[PDB]
Write a protein that binds this ligand. Structure first.
Ligand SMILES: CCCC(=O)O[C@@H]1[C@@H](C)[C@@]2(O)[C@@H](C=C(CO)C[C@]3(O)C(=O)C(C)=C[C@@H]23)[C@@H]2C(C)(C)[C@]12OC(=O)CCC
Ligand SMILES: CCCCCCC(=O)OC[C@H](COP(=O)(O)OCC[N+](C)(C)C)OC(=O)CCCCCC
Ligand SMILES: CCCCCCC(=O)OC[C@H](COP(=O)(O)OCC[N+](C)(C)C)OC(=O)CCCCCC
Ligand SMILES: [Zn+2]
Ligand SMILES: [Zn+2]
Length: 52
């Protein structure tokens, strides 16, 4: 099953589970999967493994 990512607003430092770097910024720093909670950059979304 593919992930179901949504734009998310993080309130504590959160790293991208795909590429390892911090999700930088004040708002809308990345995407969170509705089902497994994975956090990724907007631009990392297309590159993550599709097994949720
Ligand atoms: C500017 C507001 C002051 C502040 O503390 O903002 C920090 C701010 C430094 C932050 O911790 C941020 C969360 C994320 C996600 O990875 C982005 C980062 O922004 C970022 O790029 C850096 C360097 C720290 C990160 C959350 C938010 C913007 C809510 C924040 O709040 C807290 O951590 C709560 C205290 C434990
Ligand atoms: C439903 C989305 C959350 C809406 C409320 C957001 C919120 O303010 O925080 C409650 C916490 C988790 O927030 P965070 O996930 O950014 O981490 C905790 C941050 N801090 C320690 C400073 C509180 O938020 C959650 O409950 C997590 C659920 C995530 C939705 C995905 C199905
Ligand atoms: C969803 C798209 C993400 C774009 C980032 C939007 C955002 O909230 O941040 C503004 C970002 C980048 O700025 P930064 O998040 O790098 O500055 C934060 C400074 N500090 C790390 C010390 C707290 O710079 C902008 O002007 C926008
Ligand atoms: Zn998922
Ligand atoms: Zn990333």
């Amino acid at each position: 099953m593919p992930h179901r990512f949504k734009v998310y607003n993080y309130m504590s430092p959160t790293f991208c589970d795909h590429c390892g770097s911090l999700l930088w910024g004040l708002v809308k720093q990345g995407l969170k999967c509705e089902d497994c909670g994975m956090n990724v950059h907007h631009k990392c979304r297309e590159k993550v493994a599709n097994l949720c």
